[PDB]
mmCIF file of all heavy atoms in Angstrom:
data_model
loop_
_atom_site.group_PDB
_atom_site.id
_atom_site.type_symbol
_atom_site.label_atom_id
_atom_site.label_comp_id
_atom_site.label_asym_id
_atom_site.label_seq_id
_atom_site.Cartn_x
_atom_site.Cartn_y
_atom_site.Cartn_z
ATOM 1 N N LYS A 1 45.463 42.187 34.190
ATOM 2 C CA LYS A 1 44.065 42.392 34.452
ATOM 3 C C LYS A 1 43.179 41.827 33.330
ATOM 4 O O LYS A 1 42.184 41.198 33.622
ATOM 5 C CB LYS A 1 43.813 43.864 34.773
ATOM 6 C CG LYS A 1 42.393 44.211 35.153
ATOM 7 C CD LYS A 1 42.244 45.479 36.009
ATOM 8 C CE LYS A 1 43.089 46.668 35.565
ATOM 9 N NZ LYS A 1 42.850 47.828 36.456
ATOM 10 N N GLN A 2 43.600 41.958 32.079
ATOM 11 C CA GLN A 2 42.871 41.427 30.924
ATOM 12 C C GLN A 2 42.595 39.888 31.031
ATOM 13 O O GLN A 2 41.563 39.432 30.589
ATOM 14 C CB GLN A 2 43.662 41.724 29.643
ATOM 15 C CG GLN A 2 42.912 41.663 28.318
ATOM 16 C CD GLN A 2 43.881 41.544 27.121
ATOM 17 O OE1 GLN A 2 44.921 40.902 27.226
ATOM 18 N NE2 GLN A 2 43.543 42.161 25.993
ATOM 19 N N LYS A 3 43.495 39.134 31.649
ATOM 20 C CA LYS A 3 43.327 37.703 31.858
ATOM 21 C C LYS A 3 42.911 37.361 33.306
ATOM 22 O O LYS A 3 42.929 36.221 33.665
ATOM 23 C CB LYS A 3 44.652 36.962 31.500
ATOM 24 C CG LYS A 3 45.175 37.230 30.089
ATOM 25 C CD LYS A 3 44.124 36.927 29.035
ATOM 26 C CE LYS A 3 44.572 37.270 27.629
ATOM 27 N NZ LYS A 3 45.901 36.678 27.307
ATOM 28 N N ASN A 4 42.613 38.340 34.142
ATOM 29 C CA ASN A 4 42.338 38.108 35.560
ATOM 30 C C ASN A 4 43.434 37.318 36.302
ATOM 31 O O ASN A 4 43.163 36.467 37.174
ATOM 32 C CB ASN A 4 40.976 37.356 35.679
ATOM 33 C CG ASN A 4 40.282 37.610 36.977
ATOM 34 O OD1 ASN A 4 40.346 38.708 37.507
ATOM 35 N ND2 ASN A 4 39.550 36.606 37.469
ATOM 36 N N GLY A 5 44.688 37.603 35.968
ATOM 37 C CA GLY A 5 45.783 36.876 36.533
ATOM 38 C C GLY A 5 47.047 37.711 36.627
ATOM 39 O O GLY A 5 46.992 38.912 36.917
ATOM 40 N N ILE A 6 48.161 37.061 36.430
ATOM 41 C CA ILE A 6 49.448 37.679 36.551
ATOM 42 C C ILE A 6 50.310 37.345 35.367
ATOM 43 O O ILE A 6 50.018 36.408 34.619
ATOM 44 C CB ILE A 6 50.168 37.310 37.844
ATOM 45 C CG1 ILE A 6 50.502 35.815 37.925
ATOM 46 C CG2 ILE A 6 49.325 37.727 39.058
ATOM 47 C CD1 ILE A 6 51.814 35.401 37.288
ATOM 48 N N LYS A 7 51.348 38.157 35.194
ATOM 49 C CA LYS A 7 52.394 37.864 34.232
ATOM 50 C C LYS A 7 53.770 38.127 34.828
ATOM 51 O O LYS A 7 53.917 38.853 35.800
ATOM 52 C CB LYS A 7 52.220 38.638 32.908
ATOM 53 C CG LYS A 7 52.122 40.105 33.014
ATOM 54 C CD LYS A 7 51.717 40.756 31.660
ATOM 55 C CE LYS A 7 52.902 40.610 30.678
ATOM 56 N NZ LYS A 7 52.520 40.923 29.296
ATOM 57 N N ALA A 8 54.769 37.580 34.175
ATOM 58 C CA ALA A 8 56.152 37.862 34.529
ATOM 59 C C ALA A 8 56.997 37.606 33.328
ATOM 60 O O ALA A 8 56.803 36.628 32.600
ATOM 61 C CB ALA A 8 56.566 36.930 35.668
ATOM 62 N N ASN A 9 57.990 38.439 33.175
ATOM 63 C CA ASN A 9 59.009 38.234 32.154
ATOM 64 C C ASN A 9 60.367 38.295 32.866
ATOM 65 O O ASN A 9 60.625 39.286 33.568
ATOM 66 C CB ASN A 9 58.937 39.384 31.164
ATOM 67 C CG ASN A 9 57.821 39.249 30.137
ATOM 68 O OD1 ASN A 9 56.855 39.958 30.190
ATOM 69 N ND2 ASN A 9 58.054 38.456 29.099
ATOM 70 N N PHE A 10 61.216 37.272 32.677
ATOM 71 C CA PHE A 10 62.472 37.207 33.417
ATOM 72 C C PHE A 10 63.500 36.400 32.693
ATOM 73 O O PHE A 10 63.188 35.730 31.720
ATOM 74 C CB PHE A 10 62.249 36.655 34.837
ATOM 75 C CG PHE A 10 61.628 35.279 34.899
ATOM 76 C CD1 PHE A 10 62.414 34.148 35.140
ATOM 77 C CD2 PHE A 10 60.263 35.118 34.773
ATOM 78 C CE1 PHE A 10 61.827 32.891 35.223
ATOM 79 C CE2 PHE A 10 59.679 33.889 34.879
ATOM 80 C CZ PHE A 10 60.453 32.766 35.095
ATOM 81 N N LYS A 11 64.737 36.518 33.154
ATOM 82 C CA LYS A 11 65.882 35.922 32.511
ATOM 83 C C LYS A 11 66.553 34.909 33.431
ATOM 84 O O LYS A 11 66.860 35.228 34.559
ATOM 85 C CB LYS A 11 66.876 36.996 32.166
ATOM 86 C CG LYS A 11 66.414 37.924 31.067
ATOM 87 C CD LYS A 11 67.442 39.012 30.786
ATOM 88 C CE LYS A 11 66.880 40.015 29.757
ATOM 89 N NZ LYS A 11 66.972 39.405 28.398
ATOM 90 N N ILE A 12 66.793 33.710 32.947
ATOM 91 C CA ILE A 12 67.631 32.742 33.645
ATOM 92 C C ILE A 12 68.932 32.641 32.902
ATOM 93 O O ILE A 12 68.926 32.570 31.677
ATOM 94 C CB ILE A 12 66.933 31.351 33.712
ATOM 95 C CG1 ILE A 12 65.650 31.464 34.539
ATOM 96 C CG2 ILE A 12 67.890 30.293 34.289
ATOM 97 C CD1 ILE A 12 65.839 31.934 35.971
ATOM 98 N N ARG A 13 70.051 32.629 33.627
ATOM 99 C CA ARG A 13 71.389 32.417 33.055
ATOM 100 C C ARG A 13 72.013 31.091 33.511
ATOM 101 O O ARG A 13 72.362 30.962 34.665
ATOM 102 C CB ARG A 13 72.277 33.580 33.420
ATOM 103 C CG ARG A 13 72.053 34.731 32.416
ATOM 104 C CD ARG A 13 72.051 36.182 32.823
ATOM 105 N NE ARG A 13 70.842 36.551 33.547
ATOM 106 C CZ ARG A 13 70.283 37.771 33.584
ATOM 107 N NH1 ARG A 13 70.668 38.773 32.844
ATOM 108 N NH2 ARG A 13 69.257 37.959 34.379
ATOM 109 N N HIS A 14 72.134 30.123 32.604
ATOM 110 C CA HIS A 14 72.660 28.802 32.947
ATOM 111 C C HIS A 14 74.176 28.791 32.708
ATOM 112 O O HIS A 14 74.659 29.128 31.594
ATOM 113 C CB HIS A 14 72.011 27.686 32.113
ATOM 114 C CG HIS A 14 70.517 27.575 32.225
ATOM 115 N ND1 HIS A 14 69.908 27.034 33.326
ATOM 116 C CD2 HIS A 14 69.521 27.831 31.334
ATOM 117 C CE1 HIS A 14 68.593 26.985 33.128
ATOM 118 N NE2 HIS A 14 68.326 27.464 31.929
ATOM 119 N N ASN A 15 74.956 28.462 33.730
ATOM 120 C CA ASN A 15 76.406 28.274 33.525
ATOM 121 C C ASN A 15 76.723 27.117 32.543
ATOM 122 O O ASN A 15 76.194 26.027 32.688
ATOM 123 C CB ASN A 15 77.108 27.967 34.860
ATOM 124 C CG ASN A 15 77.138 29.186 35.789
ATOM 125 O OD1 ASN A 15 76.811 30.313 35.404
ATOM 126 N ND2 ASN A 15 77.504 28.968 36.996
ATOM 127 N N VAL A 16 77.585 27.390 31.588
ATOM 128 C CA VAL A 16 78.033 26.415 30.601
ATOM 129 C C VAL A 16 79.422 25.906 31.030
ATOM 130 O O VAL A 16 80.218 26.661 31.562
ATOM 131 C CB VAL A 16 78.079 27.057 29.197
ATOM 132 C CG1 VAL A 16 78.461 26.064 28.109
ATOM 133 C CG2 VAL A 16 76.734 27.666 28.848
ATOM 134 N N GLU A 17 79.694 24.637 30.776
ATOM 135 C CA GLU A 17 80.936 23.923 31.180
ATOM 136 C C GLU A 17 82.248 24.589 30.769
ATOM 137 O O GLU A 17 83.295 24.340 31.363
ATOM 138 C CB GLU A 17 80.933 22.506 30.545
ATOM 139 C CG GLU A 17 80.917 22.515 28.978
ATOM 140 C CD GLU A 17 80.734 21.155 28.283
ATOM 141 O OE1 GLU A 17 80.260 20.185 28.916
ATOM 142 O OE2 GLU A 17 81.097 21.084 27.082
ATOM 143 N N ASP A 18 82.211 25.360 29.689
ATOM 144 C CA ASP A 18 83.389 26.067 29.202
ATOM 145 C C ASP A 18 83.531 27.506 29.770
ATOM 146 O O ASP A 18 84.404 28.242 29.323
ATOM 147 C CB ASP A 18 83.343 26.083 27.670
ATOM 148 C CG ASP A 18 82.233 26.984 27.112
ATOM 149 O OD1 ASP A 18 81.333 27.430 27.850
ATOM 150 O OD2 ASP A 18 82.245 27.235 25.914
ATOM 151 N N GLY A 19 82.680 27.902 30.717
ATOM 152 C CA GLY A 19 82.772 29.223 31.333
ATOM 153 C C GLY A 19 81.850 30.296 30.741
ATOM 154 O O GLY A 19 81.737 31.381 31.307
ATOM 155 N N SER A 20 81.213 29.987 29.608
ATOM 156 C CA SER A 20 80.169 30.816 29.029
ATOM 157 C C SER A 20 78.841 30.666 29.759
ATOM 158 O O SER A 20 78.708 29.938 30.757
ATOM 159 C CB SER A 20 80.049 30.532 27.521
ATOM 160 O OG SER A 20 79.401 29.312 27.249
ATOM 161 N N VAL A 21 77.867 31.416 29.255
ATOM 162 C CA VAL A 21 76.560 31.567 29.840
ATOM 163 C C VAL A 21 75.504 31.283 28.746
ATOM 164 O O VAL A 21 75.621 31.789 27.658
ATOM 165 C CB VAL A 21 76.445 33.011 30.384
ATOM 166 C CG1 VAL A 21 75.077 33.345 30.894
ATOM 167 C CG2 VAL A 21 77.444 33.203 31.530
ATOM 168 N N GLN A 22 74.510 30.460 29.061
ATOM 169 C CA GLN A 22 73.331 30.221 28.219
ATOM 170 C C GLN A 22 72.127 30.948 28.800
ATOM 171 O O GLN A 22 71.588 30.548 29.820
ATOM 172 C CB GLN A 22 73.017 28.754 28.138
ATOM 173 C CG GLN A 22 71.739 28.415 27.380
ATOM 174 C CD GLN A 22 71.860 28.796 25.909
ATOM 175 O OE1 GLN A 22 72.686 28.239 25.189
ATOM 176 N NE2 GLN A 22 71.078 29.778 25.480
ATOM 177 N N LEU A 23 71.719 32.021 28.136
ATOM 178 C CA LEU A 23 70.538 32.792 28.513
ATOM 179 C C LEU A 23 69.234 32.068 28.133
ATOM 180 O O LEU A 23 69.108 31.513 27.033
ATOM 181 C CB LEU A 23 70.610 34.179 27.857
ATOM 182 C CG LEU A 23 69.450 35.143 28.144
ATOM 183 C CD1 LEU A 23 69.414 35.557 29.623
ATOM 184 C CD2 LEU A 23 69.631 36.389 27.290
ATOM 185 N N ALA A 24 68.274 32.105 29.015
ATOM 186 C CA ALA A 24 66.923 31.590 28.760
ATOM 187 C C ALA A 24 65.958 32.698 29.121
ATOM 188 O O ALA A 24 65.746 32.970 30.285
ATOM 189 C CB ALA A 24 66.623 30.327 29.567
ATOM 190 N N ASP A 25 65.369 33.322 28.108
ATOM 191 C CA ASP A 25 64.381 34.380 28.329
ATOM 192 C C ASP A 25 63.013 33.771 28.560
ATOM 193 O O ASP A 25 62.510 33.023 27.683
ATOM 194 C CB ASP A 25 64.359 35.307 27.102
ATOM 195 C CG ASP A 25 65.527 36.278 27.082
ATOM 196 O OD1 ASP A 25 65.584 37.106 28.017
ATOM 197 O OD2 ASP A 25 66.315 36.282 26.115
ATOM 198 N N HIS A 26 62.377 34.100 29.676
ATOM 199 C CA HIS A 26 61.105 33.505 30.074
ATOM 200 C C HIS A 26 59.997 34.539 29.895
ATOM 201 O O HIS A 26 60.158 35.705 30.317
ATOM 202 C CB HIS A 26 61.139 33.082 31.573
ATOM 203 C CG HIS A 26 61.888 31.817 31.838
ATOM 204 N ND1 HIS A 26 63.237 31.663 31.567
ATOM 205 C CD2 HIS A 26 61.490 30.675 32.442
ATOM 206 C CE1 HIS A 26 63.618 30.456 31.965
ATOM 207 N NE2 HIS A 26 62.578 29.841 32.498
ATOM 208 N N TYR A 27 58.880 34.118 29.307
ATOM 209 C CA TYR A 27 57.651 34.907 29.227
ATOM 210 C C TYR A 27 56.544 34.072 29.877
ATOM 211 O O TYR A 27 56.307 32.958 29.417
ATOM 212 C CB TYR A 27 57.265 35.158 27.759
ATOM 213 C CG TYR A 27 58.255 35.899 26.929
ATOM 214 C CD1 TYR A 27 59.385 35.263 26.376
ATOM 215 C CD2 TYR A 27 58.031 37.231 26.593
ATOM 216 C CE1 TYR A 27 60.278 35.953 25.580
ATOM 217 C CE2 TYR A 27 58.926 37.927 25.778
ATOM 218 C CZ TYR A 27 60.058 37.266 25.299
ATOM 219 O OH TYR A 27 60.954 37.972 24.541
#
């Protein structure tokens, strides 16, 4: 409301070639 708009905070998890996960935190 302070900016007359919207916000979102969310997490993307990218699969890595070796079977691990690369987290990307989005604001």
